[PDB]
């Protein structure tokens, strides 16, 4: 507690806070214990890299030398990344809402030595006023904190780690959910009509699953309009490729220029399924452009994919991705007129006087660029790469890598793109290299691994291993899927058969939550339901089938008690209640039956092959 | 209690002693009661028909009139057939384990009237006449010394044979450690468990193969193959008439014990069927159809079922029936004998006691199928061997062993399209099952002499046999028969704690109801029950069965980790029970090629259920939830379902 130990950590978001004068500590047993022997409170700060206001609180307070000594003598201050320890975030995010104050990131908390919180807040501006007031309260009111900490804690243990009575899996529960999700779709712009606009991968899954199981063409058109209009807006990089996080306005125009790995992997699957229904060439182009961007800018020397790249370059939001007309005319030359007519370039611009490239003005026309404006588009990228390039988060998250490995495996299978498979295998063997002592790591960077993993890490690697089987047909990927299943059971399955996000042997966690709340990615148990359901179709394990039906009813029992974020559970249980299985006997990959199965991607079906 | 009542017993080993001057008594309540009324210790003699040193003690002592008079004077004499009453065998073999003796058969022990033992020895030749008087002194001098150590032995028996600790969770990691240490004991060059003698060790081989299937462990697979291939190429195998002998004296599988057991060949046929399906080595295929020919020709009784064993002593000499000399081979085969002598390593000096034991260890890697001139000499030498004095046969029809043979024939007949093997398996199944009246099957019978009640191994073996015949025929009646066999086991062996006991709960001649947790040459009773109840769950999909099986597994694992040896079968069964595979086949006609693929892909972890709704034809099978439909051969009909 007298030296900043945030150096060498696998999270790049914490590495930037290493030079801070406050002795930052990582979340671990050595941090909580020191708070006991010194009877000093804990000050927890949660944040993620692509958050403009996590850096604001840094330069305003934490990077200031004076206010850090106030923290160094009053608490044991710890910094956590929302994406390195998502278990810690979800615990103390729901802890804030239970105190009667909603908030987001950064999140500043106050913890007694055992970890239970008693006061929190989003961003703290008097900051130092409280920074001492809690220290006063820590000494003046030990009786008040113990009364207040265990009251919020009992609300957490009942909201995040309390099993419910089993609930019967019924079809009408999903059809009801699909009707209400459909009523939130903006009929003209696409997506949830509220602003800001998020891609909302779980919300899309319900509409597509509604279209497949019910042939409800209304939700199918809601899925297609929302996906297609988004991929045409400024939220997508029409020059290099890759989708951004979310949109500021409802027209999908002005975005947050950070590019997350999970959002790109989750739309490749959506666009892949969407191509098989409409044949619209735009879905294929967006997939092909984003995959090239993933290999070029996200893939690490070892093959694994980085987490994300920054939205800020050289100190301004999106300086790297936006153009003015006077510069694109200087580089292109005579071919500059047709380029500006393609991406709605205007002298006045569409964002703060600048021009963000988009294809919303001609979204229904042909998506393929003419040969002159394609060479003009490629020429700008070579000139754009000379700019001050935004920083990258080289942290290799196992759960996020599994999402991408599954995306490249399924899209490469349907489009017969053999190059996409090889890069999926490289990321597979790179992530799978950390599997030692019957366990895998959560994240990794610069040779530093974070153990133990989370339940999402095994579920994602189970789904990626099974996807690699469908594309290849090598049964060694099914054996890998069972190896990940055994590791998941040995560390996350409780006595009731339920799975919990944090490992049961992890000692630095207050609460072993199930992980039932979705975000941009479906929840942990949501992914686990799907992964185990697909693993049954690939093996025929009857004991797995019997334990899955229990797991389904347990999760549905808690999902009924949830107020939000249960969409992934109802989606996975709808698929688990009626899965599709297809065995194909063939003599080679060129067989007709194998081909029409490849050209028919279905998230509800798992393919199996036998030599004949 | 004054005569030899051993005649009429369902055993050939006991009838060999019916004419002994000893007033032998079959094990039962009458012998225990007669021992109490006369204040006399019981002279228990346990053996089996194939044992060589069981016959030498009978020829030295049990047929001697001088020592038969003193056995009838101050002892009540009870002889037990090991294969007829294996529950009694496990009770009093553990008694020697509590006394410090190594153990073995013949087993000669001394029991006080209540049945608890106080002094036990393996083989006591004559002295035998002295040790009888020595024990006879203790019963009239100091009985308290007997009553002290007799209770001390019993407490150790109930603490190891029928002690139930708290249940334990089913873990896969503890199965991998067992497979790792077993493979470390395998002979890297000669195969099998390194050390003499070398036994087939069926439970050990089950672990190595399960480790290969569940872990893709190529090392354990090659250990299973090299051990099986070398054994089937050694002198322990009958290269003329087929069949496997029960163990080998040396480490090269050369010199064997020439007796042939039913459980040995039933167990290796299933192993060889699995080995052929992966390697494609014709040696495994040839050895199977050679031994099945031997089972039908030499072991099958006229009433359908299979005999228990085939003796090793012919005309009083060990293996005289199977062993050849060179000059006789030259006389029978003529000028084409050198082609045969080189194929089976026939030498003028002989490989065992101046004579030749036919084998293939000289070239076990060459082509297994012999050339046509050699097989012609092979068929003719076997027929000439049939003119020899033939070794005797134990016509006793053990239920559990017949169940093992039915399963082997049903699985091999299914993977080789041999319908004649299935009908022979149905003959034994219907014949043995004829004693299943009043919800009670018999443990064994011979010449109209039945033995009741059955043991837990009998129902477990019949369940596995019934479900094996279902996979080969697809008849639902075999499933209900499998249900009938379990519920009879429930009503006669399942205790209040949900566990099963080897002896029936109504049995009166057992001093201790053991669980049957200890393996022998066959997996233990508890193992077969876990396997049968798992395969019954696969064939029926009954959720109530799955729930009571998981808690039966956890209670068996609690006892399995306390015991120090003989738990391999339970660990093998629980690994399969933790990951059992089922295959649903939706066929429009039973000539559907998925039925073919399943037949040529035998897996000891999979059970196939059929639901009716020749060359290789590219097809597709589609299932929507619990709704499976017949296959599809065209490209358009597949687009309709997708
Ligand atoms: Cl045995």
């Amino acid at each position: 507690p007298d030296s900043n130990r945030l150096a060498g950590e696998p999270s790049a978001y914490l590495r930037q806070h290493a030079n801070n004068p406050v002795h930052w500590q990582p979340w671990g047993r050595k941090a909580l214990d020191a708070a006991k022997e010194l009877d000093r409170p804990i000050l927890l700060s949660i944040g993620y890299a692509a958050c403009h206001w996590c850096h604001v609180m840094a330069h305003e307070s934490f990077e200031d030398d004076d206010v850090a000594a106030v923290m160094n003598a009053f608490f044991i201050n710890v910094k956590v990344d929302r994406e390195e320890r998502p278990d810690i975030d979800q615990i103390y995010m729901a802890a804030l809402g239970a105190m009667g104050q909603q908030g987001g990131w950064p999140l500043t908390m106050f913890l007694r030595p055992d970890g239970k919180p008693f006061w929190g807040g989003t961003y703290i501006p008097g900051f130092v006023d409280i920074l001492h007031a809690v220290n006063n309260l820590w000494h003046r009111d030990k009786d008040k904190i113990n009364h207040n900490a265990e009251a919020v804690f009992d609300h957490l243990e009942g909201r995040l780690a309390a099993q419910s009575q089993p609930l019967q899996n019924e079809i009408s529960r999903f059809d009801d959910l699909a009707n209400r999700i459909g009523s939130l779709i903006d009929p003209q712009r696409g997506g949830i009509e509220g602003v800001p606009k998020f891609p909302n991968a779980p919300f899309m899954d319900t509409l597509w699953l509604s279209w497949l199981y019910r042939h409800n063409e209304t939700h199918r058109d809601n899925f297609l309009l929302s996906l297609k209009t988004m991929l045409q807006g400024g939220i997508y990089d029409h020059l290099g490729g890759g989708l951004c996080r979310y949109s500021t306005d409802a027209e999908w125009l002005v975005p947050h220029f950070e590019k997350m790995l999970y959002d790109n992997a989750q739309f490749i699957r959506h666009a892949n399924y969407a191509f098989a229904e409409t044949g619209d060439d735009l879905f294929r182009i967006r997939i092909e452009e984003t995959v090239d961007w993933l290999i070029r800018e996200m893939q690490l020397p070892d093959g694994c994919f980085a987490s994300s790249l920054d939205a800020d370059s050289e100190g301004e939001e999106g300086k790297f991705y936006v153009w003015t007309e006077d510069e694109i005319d200087a580089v292109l030359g005579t071919d500059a007129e047709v380029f500006k007519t393609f991406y709605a370039v205007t002298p006045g611009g569409n964002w703060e006087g600048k021009n963000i490239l988009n294809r919303l003005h001609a979204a229904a026309e042909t998506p393929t660029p003419p040969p002159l404006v394609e060479a003009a588009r490629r020429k700008l990228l070579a000139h754009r790469e000379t700019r001050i390039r935004p920083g990258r988060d080289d942290k290799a998250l196992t759960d996020w890598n599994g999402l991408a490995i599954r995306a490249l495996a399924e899209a490469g299978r349907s489009f017969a793109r053999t190059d996409w498979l090889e890069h999926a295998v490289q990321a597979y063997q790179s992530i799978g290299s950390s599997f030692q002592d019957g366990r895998i790591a959560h994240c990794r960077m610069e040779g530093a691994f974070l153990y133990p993993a989370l339940a999402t890490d095994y579920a994602a690697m189970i789904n990626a291993a099974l996807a690699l089987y469908e594309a290849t047909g090598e049964f060694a990927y099914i054996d890998d899927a069972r190896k990940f299943k055994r590791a998941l059971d040995g560390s996350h399955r409780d006595s009731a058969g339920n799975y919990r996000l944090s490992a049961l042997g992890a000692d630095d966690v207050i609460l072993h939550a199930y992980g039932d709340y979705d975000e941009a990615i479906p929840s942990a148990t949501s992914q686990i339901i799907e992964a185990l359901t697909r693993l049954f179709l690939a093996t025929g394990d009857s004991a797995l089938y019997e334990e899955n039906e229990k797991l389904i009813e347990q999760a549905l029992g808690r999902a009924l008690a949830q107020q939000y974020g249960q969409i992934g559970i109802l989606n996975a249980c709808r698929f688990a209640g009626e899965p599709l299985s297809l065995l194909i006997a063939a003599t080679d990959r060129t067989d007709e039956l194998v081909s029409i199965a490849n050209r028919t991607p279905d998230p509800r079906r798992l393919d199996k092959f036998v030599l004949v």
Side-chain angles (χ1 to χ4, degrees), chain A residues 325-336:
Chain A
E325 181 177 355
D326 289 301
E327 187 185 16
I328 57 184
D329 295 330
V331 183
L332 298 177
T334 180
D335 302 304

Side-chain angles (χ1 to χ4, degrees), chain A residues 550-573:
Chain A
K550 304 178 186 178
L551 183 62
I552 295 167
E553 297 191 345
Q554 286 291 300
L556 289 168
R558 302 188 298 269
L560 190 69
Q562 288 184 225
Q563 304 169 347
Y564 68 92
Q566 73 281 312
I567 301 183
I569 302 302
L570 306 182
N571 290 333
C573 295

Side-chain angles (χ1 to χ4, degrees), chain A residues 290-324:
Chain A
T290 305
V291 171
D292 290 336
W293 163 79
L294 236 97
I295 305 166
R296 176 215 317 153
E297 305 185 22
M298 287 308 198
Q299 192 170 78
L300 295 178
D302 201 67
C304 46
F305 295 105
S307 296
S308 58
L309 45 81
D310 223 336
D312 293 0
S313 56
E314 69 183 14
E316 294 189 341
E317 177 183 5
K319 187 68 174 300
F320 183 82
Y321 295 105
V322 194
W323 301 86
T324 188

Side-chain angles (χ1 to χ4, degrees), chain A residues 322-386:
Chain A
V322 194
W323 301 86
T324 188
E325 181 177 355
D326 289 301
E327 187 185 16
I328 57 184
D329 295 330
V331 183
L332 298 177
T334 180
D335 302 304
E337 298 87 78
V338 283
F339 186 94
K340 301 188 297 293
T341 333
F342 200 106
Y343 300 106
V345 182
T346 291
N350 51 6
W351 179 62
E352 315 283 13
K354 293 289 230 64
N355 283 279
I356 53 178
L357 317 97
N358 69 114
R359 237 277 129 99
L360 292 171
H361 57 282
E365 301 163 22
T366 169
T368 300
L372 272 187
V373 327
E374 172 67 16
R377 193 204 58 151
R378 178 171 181 81
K379 185 180 182 182
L380 258 198
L381 181 57
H383 170 253
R384 195 182 80 177
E385 292 280 16
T386 59

Side-chain angles (χ1 to χ4, degrees), chain A residues 298-595:
Chain A
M298 287 308 198
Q299 192 170 78
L300 295 178
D302 201 67
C304 46
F305 295 105
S307 296
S308 58
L309 45 81
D310 223 336
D312 293 0
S313 56
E314 69 183 14
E316 294 189 341
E317 177 183 5
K319 187 68 174 300
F320 183 82
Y321 295 105
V322 194
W323 301 86
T324 188
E325 181 177 355
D326 289 301
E327 187 185 16
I328 57 184
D329 295 330
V331 183
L332 298 177
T334 180
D335 302 304
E337 298 87 78
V338 283
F339 186 94
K340 301 188 297 293
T341 333
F342 200 106
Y343 300 106
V345 182
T346 291
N350 51 6
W351 179 62
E352 315 283 13
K354 293 289 230 64
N355 283 279
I356 53 178
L357 317 97
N358 69 114
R359 237 277 129 99
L360 292 171
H361 57 282
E365 301 163 22
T366 169
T368 300
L372 272 187
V373 327
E374 172 67 16
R377 193 204 58 151
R378 178 171 181 81
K379 185 180 182 182
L380 258 198
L381 181 57
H383 170 253
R384 195 182 80 177
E385 292 280 16
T386 59
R387 287 178 165 180
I388 292 299
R389 186 166 160 81
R392 190 178 62 185
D393 185 9
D394 303 334
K395 168 186 54 186
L397 283 166
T398 297
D399 53 338
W400 292 7
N401 279 262
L403 265 57
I405 293 169
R406 179 177 185 174
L408 296 181
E410 293 187 350
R413 168 172 178 252
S414 49
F415 291 98
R417 287 293 301 269
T418 185
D419 52 314
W420 300 351
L421 277 73
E422 178 77 306
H423 293 284
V425 175
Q426 293 171 340
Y428 187 84
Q429 285 176 320
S430 67
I431 289 296
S433 58
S434 61
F435 199 98
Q436 294 269 298
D437 283 358
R439 59 168 186 175
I440 209 180
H442 181 56
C443 69
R444 31 187 262 175
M445 193 179 72
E446 298 184 354
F449 301 162
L450 168 63
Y451 289 93
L454 302 180
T456 45
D457 300 324
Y458 293 118
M461 290 304 292
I462 286 180
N463 281 323
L466 295 178
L468 255 65
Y469 168 74
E470 294 190 35
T472 331
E474 303 185 26
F475 304 92
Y477 289 136
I478 304 179
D479 289 318
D480 288 330
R482 304 186 306 108
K483 189 182 186 185
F484 296 147
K485 164 62 163 50
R486 275 172 289 181
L488 168 66
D489 286 336
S491 303
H492 302 78
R493 190 170 66 185
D494 56 15
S495 54
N498 299 329
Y499 295 88
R500 293 164 191 268
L501 188 56
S502 307
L504 296 179
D507 49 69
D508 59 356
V509 286
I510 279 187
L511 197 61
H512 289 88
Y514 299 104
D516 314 293
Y517 287 88
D518 323 339
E519 287 281 345
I521 310 173
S523 54
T525 51
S526 169
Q527 301 191 240
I528 290 180
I529 295 292
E530 181 195 23
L532 299 190
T533 297
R534 297 169 83 246
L535 182 56
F536 163 69
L537 301 174
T539 60
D541 194 339
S542 295
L544 175 63
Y545 178 88
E546 278 294 337
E547 290 300 312
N548 284 343
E549 296 280 18
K550 304 178 186 178
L551 183 62
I552 295 167
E553 297 191 345
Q554 286 291 300
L556 289 168
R558 302 188 298 269
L560 190 69
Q562 288 184 225
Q563 304 169 347
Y564 68 92
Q566 73 281 312
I567 301 183
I569 302 302
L570 306 182
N571 290 333
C573 295
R574 184 60 186 88
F575 157 62
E578 193 178 16
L580 303 183
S581 181
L582 182 64
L583 169 64
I584 299 175
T587 180
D588 201 337
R589 321 302 298 176
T590 332
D591 188 73
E592 187 184 37
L593 301 185
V594 180
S595 295

